[PDB]
Design a binder for this molecule. Structure first.
Ligand SMILES: *[C@@H]1O[C@H](CO)[C@@H](O[C@@H]2O[C@H](CO)[C@@H](O[C@@H]3O[C@H](CO[C@H]4O[C@H](CO[C@H]5O[C@H](CO)[C@@H](O)[C@H](O)[C@@H]5O[C@H]5O[C@H](CO)[C@@H](O)[C@H](O)[C@@H]5O)[C@@H](O)[C@H](O[C@H]5O[C@H](CO)[C@@H](O)[C@H](O)[C@@H]5O)[C@@H]4O)[C@@H](O)[C@H](O[C@H]4O[C@H](CO)[C@@H](O)[C@H](O)[C@@H]4O[C@H]4O[C@H](CO)[C@@H](O)[C@H](O)[C@@H]4O[C@H]4O[C@H](CO)[C@@H](O)[C@H](O)[C@@H]4O)[C@@H]3O)[C@H](O)[C@H]2NC(C)=O)[C@H](O)[C@H]1NC(C)=O
Ligand SMILES: *[C@@H]1O[C@H](CO)[C@@H](O[C@@H]2O[C@H](CO)[C@@H](O[C@@H]3O[C@H](CO)[C@@H](O)[C@H](O)[C@@H]3O)[C@H](O)[C@H]2NC(C)=O)[C@H](O)[C@H]1NC(C)=O
Ligand SMILES: *[C@H]1O[C@H](CO)[C@@H](O[C@@H]2O[C@H](CO)[C@@H](O[C@@H]3O[C@H](CO)[C@@H](O)[C@H](O)[C@@H]3O)[C@H](O)[C@H]2NC(C)=O)[C@H](O)[C@H]1NC(C)=O
Ligand SMILES: *[C@H]1O[C@H](CO)[C@@H](O[C@@H]2O[C@H](CO)[C@@H](O[C@@H]3O[C@H](CO)[C@@H](O)[C@H](O)[C@@H]3O)[C@H](O)[C@H]2NC(C)=O)[C@H](O)[C@H]1NC(C)=O
Ligand SMILES: *[C@@H]1O[C@H](CO)[C@@H](O[C@@H]2O[C@H](CO)[C@@H](O)[C@H](O)[C@H]2NC(C)=O)[C@H](O)[C@H]1NC(C)=O
Ligand SMILES: CN1C(=O)CN=C(c2ccccc2)c2cc(Cl)ccc21
Ligand SMILES: CN1C(=O)CN=C(c2ccccc2)c2cc(Cl)ccc21
Ligand SMILES: *[C@@H]1O[C@H](CO)[C@@H](O)[C@H](O)[C@H]1NC(C)=O
Ligand SMILES: *[C@@H]1O[C@H](CO)[C@@H](O)[C@H](O)[C@H]1NC(C)=O
Lengths: 255, 333, 254, 106, 208, 255
């Protein structure tokens, strides 16, 4: 899940089944497990992803597509593809935030009176995530959530199938990256309160070097997340820690 | 016209799936190159870019015509209609031809069936660089090619006498390196599919130490002399000498770290790591020497009086001797 | 002549050839044997959690429709005939971006044998994906693998195996990684089960052990030196406060 | 307006001797300088089209030398048919010619 | 840094082809997106783009739709990186106009005519766009004719004015600099006998 | 203009025109303004760029090409394409240098006795740069300069049309990046001469701090320019400023 692009990546087997009465046959086999070049000679639905950015349909070493025709006319059409979708995030509670990254698909050019979509199993059991299939370093996938709806655009009314993946960010990186250096700098600023007032350069270089370290931590910490215009919870922590360090130097100045 | 009837008569009953002399003898292919430029040799990914005009020539007894014209000079339109060898570069990570504005290919067929096929290529070839002696190093890393599907008994390659020609050598993208020469090679390699005739062109490059000099060799030596200037400062100003030494240590660390990002993540010591390491050691020794000086002025002053006067002559001579032995030992190799 | 005989043979083999049907479309499954000749392993990235490898990937099976007996030699054909023949739909499950090289032509090989054996080779540069456990970084070892599966054809339509079963993957002892070192490699044959059927799978797994030579001379030696340069303040008396505080804080800054 | 200055304004020369004519441009004219020859009561004939390219029907004794601004026309074994005027003209912009050099015999 | 903006759009064109006119069936025809390679579609291009593509998952994201009178509707889903040069003399308190130029390549103004279908509601979905750094204040649609050495060509122009937000830049650069500048004023409260303290403080602020 | 790659980018309408007597017609129209798929059925010249690295020909939404056939047989063929060409630079006077970036094009596969090129208008008026056509941030386009010549290859002589764009680098970035901070750091070193001789740590940290910032300035200033193996003007400026700061510190040591 890329946080600076507000996007995520997913790799799926995307299966679509429908029924074509023109493809009925009668032979020694009840299911024809055909190639991926017969699918380009028949009608297949034009499913696209409403929030996709740059997706790829893999074709190594051949087009990763599957076509099975059943003798009564039912087709199973499966693709292997990598989808890069948009996940609009609200980072007020960063880095202790939970998101629901969506994945919406439907048909391009076929309205509700022409093509309607459906889940093939029970909606809680349709989008299935593998166990070893998790390339998440920073987040934790909690569960999935599907939905169905009807969007309306300038070309007609369309059916939209929605999936939500619920993610929970892991704080263990931002702790050691930002929260523990800030606490270490604040305690190192508060060390100065035990030195004797006859050593003015000692407490001076204490104060100024901890203020420099806080400045470096703030600039180096704000580059992780995107350039949002609101304050996060790491920004509030950094601001209060900076206030404490600056207050320690001002108290030294008063003393 | 007449060229249209000749071209239409050559392509009737023609099979571009079969090489000439498919069951008679191997096909002899004469190859020429013209290196337009050797691009940047970046050591991070262990690769280098090259731009060439690759020319092949062979004999096809099916493209033999009788006419008053001697040569048919064609575009890339007919390249995909006759047999073309499946030459591929064995040490290339990525390679593409050129397609703007029209596919940069050339086909010329002669009166006796001799075909000449030239195309422009940009190759991103691979060569493992033994990055010892860096940056005083010299490399010779190849560009190899062979046929993909046809073994030695089916396709044989052969250089001409004027095989590889370089261009101007001054408009090339070699910033840190310098071209010195080349040499061709032919060999036969055993592969799971068969024995293949492989041809190699080795380009010899030598790294010019003009960027790494003003980046690391001059500033690290200057920082060493900066640590040296602490000896002439009075031994009573303790915060001055301590701050000088430790800030000099800061400068050495920052310069070392920013200097190691040029070369790849090799695990051995180079001729550049040793230099910055010894400079750090020198700064470390100067600071620890002042530390022992400040302890010894309090413990016993008879030993600490002439220690700084000894350091003032021992540090530059040791560094100069290190520089002499280092530079001779790494320029002899 | 011989060129005419080969020409009529190739013209007879390709006339009335159905590319939609695999060999033995109603009968037993077809057996495909794999060879991999690893040319290089390019860049093992820990930040992207992937690695790149160039390979010579070869598949061998037997198609009785491409059988001939009038000529005694093996037929290496121009690679464009691979679009007129049936080739298996092998894919890599954990890849992120793959391609066949295309200079000067498409880098692939197609060879017919008189008993029907088809030999089909590709030159691929695969960016396969592997998650790494960096809890012991940089003193860690990573098993990074290339999964090889058949997409459309189930285990009762196709069958995978390694050609040789121990020497099917070559060129692993010649790989020169700048940061790792291959200690061991394994070839695995199994079957996986999806909701559409059971599919054969091969697995080529490599154990990559990380060197320490860069990390020592980049992180471990400086940190120890800076700790010694922080210890040196104990040899400074407690009177000079400014010196000891500046030294300690600047060791912290370093 | 690119001005071409031709030198000398008038010259004399015998038979069988090398001769050199010069043309200098104020601005840049790449290789688009041409040399014309005009006999009395005749139309000018193009001798050298572009910098250093002979026209079809010109003997091999005329040869030109080009640069960005300085241009030369040299004749080798001069016969008695080179008694004419010679103009240099640029074609990088709207064409402007030189003043001419009249070769004479003495 | 690249002086460009990427935008995804559903770009639809509608014209009338009297050759694609039928009257036996009464309904509108949505055909497979591969029949658009056998019809005439206009050669529309974007003059200021750097990289563009039609999405091709799960198929080529394009739409063809016929009407019984002859009208053809032709939509694409395009992600394009258009080049807008910015004037950063007031960065980050600036407002920039980035414009997608839409022109016809082959056909002059005597072969084709461009117009916005609606002329103000032709472009939708602008008010629902949320950017992390900017905020769309206004957008305009402009019809035009440009003149080259080959002819006069129709042009449409969709220009958006983007205003940049300031809060990020405040907390990232403006607040640390102001705080270091107040902190650098403590050098006067220290007495002028202690020299090392005032040097360390002033020098540290300058370095920060 | 990418100085790090020794290259530049240029977006052009590339127009070619020749005469083909096999495409004469007699109809109601005098010029057929045809499609971009008729130009693949006829002969078109195979122009390539001699110094182009990786050029693109735009395909959005249709192939950006133009074919017009006039009744007497003349053909006008126009393409829209993005050339990424090579500009060899001599960065000895950086950042006060001027360049002439070339753009050489000619014919592949057709020698001088087969296909010759020429400018359609006066050579000073053939390459035309638009007014608002400038994506330059660091340079300044001064003008254009065309030429025509012959290249002698191993296969024959080929016509080569050359175009030089003259560029002048703008110093305004490098002044504020390097030349003004170097001067301010040298002044900061020179301000140490006014402190009293009884403040030894003060002048010590002045000198050593100025040396540290000069070092960080030189490293930050070298990373913009590519890794050339010679000395530029900025390198000499930084060298003399470093000499001044180091001389100030040695003078303090002697005092
Ligand atoms: C996974 O999926 C991938 C996506 O589908 C897939 O990639 C595709 O692979 C195929 C096969 O390798 C590619 O197909 C070929 O492309 C060749 C040229 O290729 C390069 O150019 C394309 C763009 O194609 C355009 O530009 C060229 C040059 O101008 C044109 O000639 C093409 O027609 C085409 O032009 C259109 O688009 C232009 C704008 O781009 C317009 O300006 C133009 O007007 C047209 O509208 C790039 O995409 C390629 O990039 C890729 O590959 C390289 C490889 O290294 C990568 O590095 C790179 O990153 C990209 O990935 C590359 O730049 C074509 O020449 C070729 O056409 C020939 O051969 C076949 C087979 O024989 C013929 O059937 C076909 O007719 C073509 O033949 C003729 O023309 C040649 C010219 O050389 C003649 O020699 C020949 O005699 C024949 O002439 C005949 O027909 C002429 C009319 O056509 C006629 O005039 C003659 O008289 C004669 O009758 C073929 O199309 C395809 O482009 C790739 N696409 C992409 C997006 O990558 C990948 O392989 C898949 N992988 C697997 C494992 O399955
Ligand atoms: C650039 O754009 C053009 C047009 O938008 C693309 O051309 C289209 O290319 C495809 C692929 O070849 C053509 O499809 C084919 O039709 C032939 C029958 O002629 C069929 O035999 C093939 O199997 C394939 O289905 C398509 O017709 C063609 N469209 C037009 C209008 O010519 C071109 O591919 C694009 N290039 C790139 C690099 O994007
Ligand atoms: C790196 O990791 C992979 C994946 O964990 C290892 O692969 C595993 O290899 C073992 C032994 O080679 C296999 O286990 C065996 O299972 C068979 C039957 O399933 C059983 O008869 C044996 O007793 C044994 O338990 C296992 O199949 C395989 N796992 C998978 C899912 O592929 C691999 O060995 C590791 N090392 C390297 C360097 O390859
Ligand atoms: C952002 O920049 C663009 C580019 O200049 C601005 O577009 C300009 O918009 C004005 C107002 O719509 C156009 O002026 C009009 O000219 C016509 C002439 O036919 C006249 O009839 C109208 O009364 C009006 O004066 C102008 O043509 C147009 N410039 C170009 C080159 O397209 C745009 O307004 C700026 N602001 C925003 C919010 O987009
Ligand atoms: C390139 O290869 C050719 C042949 O492979 C080399 O040619 C020979 O040059 C020597 C003298 O230097 C002659 O005695 C041989 O007879 C030549 N060979 C042939 C086949 O004529 C050529 O030197 C190579 N170029 C290099 C190494 O730069
Ligand atoms: C991180 N680092 C430093 O802090 C300075 N000294 C070290 C070092 C110093 C002594 C022994 C070993 C290593 C060093 C060496 C290099 Cl080649 C790059 C960065 C670097
Ligand atoms: C002098 N020369 C060659 O011999 C190789 N082929 C030629 C050429 C080849 C085909 C068409 C036009 C020109 C070429 C192209 C360049 Cl960009 C630089 C040097 C060069
Ligand atoms: C064909 O290939 C097989 C497999 O290696 C080999 O045994 C046989 O000798 C080859 N035939 C010829 C004629 O080389
Ligand atoms: C076809 O579309 C038009 C407008 O898009 C609409 O008015 C008409 O009702 C449609 N035809 C049918 C049969 O629905």
């Amino acid at each position: 899940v890329s946080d600076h692009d507000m996007e995520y990546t997913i790799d799926v087997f995307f299966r679509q089944s429908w029924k074509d009465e023109r493809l009925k046959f009668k032979g020694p086999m009840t299911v024809l497990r055909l190639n991926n070049l017969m699918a380009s000679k028949i009608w297949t639905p034009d499913t696209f992803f409403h929030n996709g950015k740059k997706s790829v349909a893999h074709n190594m070493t051949m087009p990763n597509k599957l076509l099975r025709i059943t003798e009564d006319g039912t087709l199973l059409y499966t693709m292997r593809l990598t989808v890069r979708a948009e996940c609009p995030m609200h980072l007020e509670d960063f880095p202790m935030d939970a998101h629901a990254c969506p994945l919406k698909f439907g048909s391009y050019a076929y309205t509700r009176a022409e093509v309607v979509y459906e889940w093939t199993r029970e909606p809680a059991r349709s989008v299935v995530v593998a166990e070893d299939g998790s390339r998440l370093n920073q987040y934790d996938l909690l569960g999935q959530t599907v939905d169905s709806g009807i969007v309306q655009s300038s070309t007609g009314e369309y059916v939209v199938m929605t999936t939500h993946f619920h993610l929970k960010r892991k704080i263990g990186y931002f702790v050691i990256q930002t929260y523990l250096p800030c606490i270490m700098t604040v305690i190192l600023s508060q060390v100065s309160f035990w030195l004797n007032r006859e050593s003015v350069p000692a407490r001076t270089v204490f104060g100024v070097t901890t203020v420099l370290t806080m400045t470096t931590l703030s600039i180096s910490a704000r580059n992780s997340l995107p350039k949002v215009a609101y304050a996060t919870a790491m920004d509030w922590f950094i601001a209060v820690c900076y206030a404490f360090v600056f207050s320690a130097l001002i108290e030294f100045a008063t003393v | 016209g007449d060229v249209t009837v000749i071209l239409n008569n050559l392509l009737e009953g023609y099979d571009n799936k079969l090489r000439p002399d498919i069951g008679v003898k191997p096909t002899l292919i004469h190859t020429d190159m013209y290196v337009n430029s050797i691009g940047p040799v970046n050591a991070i990914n262990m690769e280098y870019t090259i731009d060439i005009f690759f020319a092949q020539t062979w004999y096809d007894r099916r493209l033999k015509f009788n006419s008053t014209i001697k040569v048919l000079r064609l575009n890339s339109n007919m390249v995909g209609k006759i047999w073309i060898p499946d030459t591929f570069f064995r040490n290339s990570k990525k390679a593409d031809a050129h397609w703007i504005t029209t596919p940069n290919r050339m086909l010329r067929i002669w009166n006796d069936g001799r075909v000449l096929y030239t195309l422009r290529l940009t190759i991103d070839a691979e060569c493992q660089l033994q990055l010892h002696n860096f940056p005083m190093d010299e490399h010779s890393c190849p560009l190899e090619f062979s046929s993909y599907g046809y073994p030695r008994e089916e396709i044989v390659y052969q250089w001409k006498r004027s095989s590889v020609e370089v261009g101007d050598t001054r408009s090339w993208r070699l910033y840190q390196f310098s071209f010195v020469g080349l040499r061709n090679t032919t060999e036969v390699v055993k592969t799971t599919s068969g024995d293949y005739v492989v041809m190699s062109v080795y380009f010899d490059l030598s790294r010019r130490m003009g960027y790494f000099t003003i980046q690391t060799y001059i500033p690290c030596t200057l920082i060493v002399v900066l640590s040296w200037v602490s000896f002439w400062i009075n031994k009573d100003a303790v915060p001055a000498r301590t701050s000088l030494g430790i800030t000099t240590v800061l400068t050495m660390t920052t310069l070392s770290t920013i200097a190691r990002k040029s070369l790849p993540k090799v695990s051995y010591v180079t001729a550049m790591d040793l230099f910055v390491s010894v400079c750090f050691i020198f700064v470390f020794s100067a600071l620890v020497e002042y530390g022992t000086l400040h302890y010894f002025v309090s413990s016993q002053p008879a030993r600490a009086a002439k220690m700084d006067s000894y350091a003032r002559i021992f540090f530059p001579t040791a560094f100069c001797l290190f520089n002499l032995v280092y530079w001779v030992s790494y320029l002899y190799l | 002549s011989n060129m005419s005989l080969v020409k009529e043979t190739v013209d007879r083999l390709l006339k009335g050839y159905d590319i939609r049907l695999r060999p033995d479309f109603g009968g037993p499954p077809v057996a495909v044997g794999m060879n991999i000749d690893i040319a290089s392993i390019d860049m093992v990235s820990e930040v992207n959690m992937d690695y790149t490898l160039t390979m010579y990937f070869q598949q061998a099976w037997r198609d009785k429709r491409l059988s001939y007996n009038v000529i005694p030699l093996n037929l290496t054909l121009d690679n464009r005939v691979a679009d007129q023949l049936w080739v298996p739909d092998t894919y890599f499950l954990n890849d992120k971006k793959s391609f066949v090289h295309g200079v000067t032509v498409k880098n692939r090989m197609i060879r017919l044998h008189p008993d029907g054996t088809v030999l089909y080779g590709l030159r691929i540069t695969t960016t396969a994906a592997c998650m790494m456990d960096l809890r012991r970084y940089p003193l860690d070892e990573q098993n990074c693998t290339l999964e090889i599966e058949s997409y459309g054809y189930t285990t009762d339509d196709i069958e995978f195996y390694w050609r040789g079963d121990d020497n099917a993957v070559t060129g692993v002892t010649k790989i020169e990684l700048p940061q790792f070192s291959i200690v061991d490699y394994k070839l695995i044959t199994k079957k996986v089960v999806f909701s559409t059927g059971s599919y054969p799978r091969l697995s080529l797994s490599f154990k990559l052990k990380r060197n320490i030579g860069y990390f020592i001379l980049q992180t471990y030696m400086p940190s120890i030196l800076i700790t010694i340069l922080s210890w040196v303040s104990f040899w400074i008396n407690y009177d000079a406060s400014a010196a000891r505080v500046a030294l300690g804080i600047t060791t912290v800054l370093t | 307006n690119i001005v071409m200055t031709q030198s000398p304004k008038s010259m004399s020369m015998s038979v069988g001797e090398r001769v050199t004519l010069s043309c200098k441009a104020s601005e840049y004219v790449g290789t688009y300088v041409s040399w014309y020859q005009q006999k009395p009561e005749q139309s000018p004939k193009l001798l050298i089209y572009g910098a250093s390219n002979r026209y079809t029907g010109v003997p091999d004794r005329f040869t030109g030398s080009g640069s960005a601004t300085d241009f030369t026309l040299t004749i080798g074994s001069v016969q008695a048919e080179d008694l004419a005027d010679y103009h240099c003209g640029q074609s990088y912009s709207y064409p402007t010619f030189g003043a001419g050099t009249k070769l004479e015999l003495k």
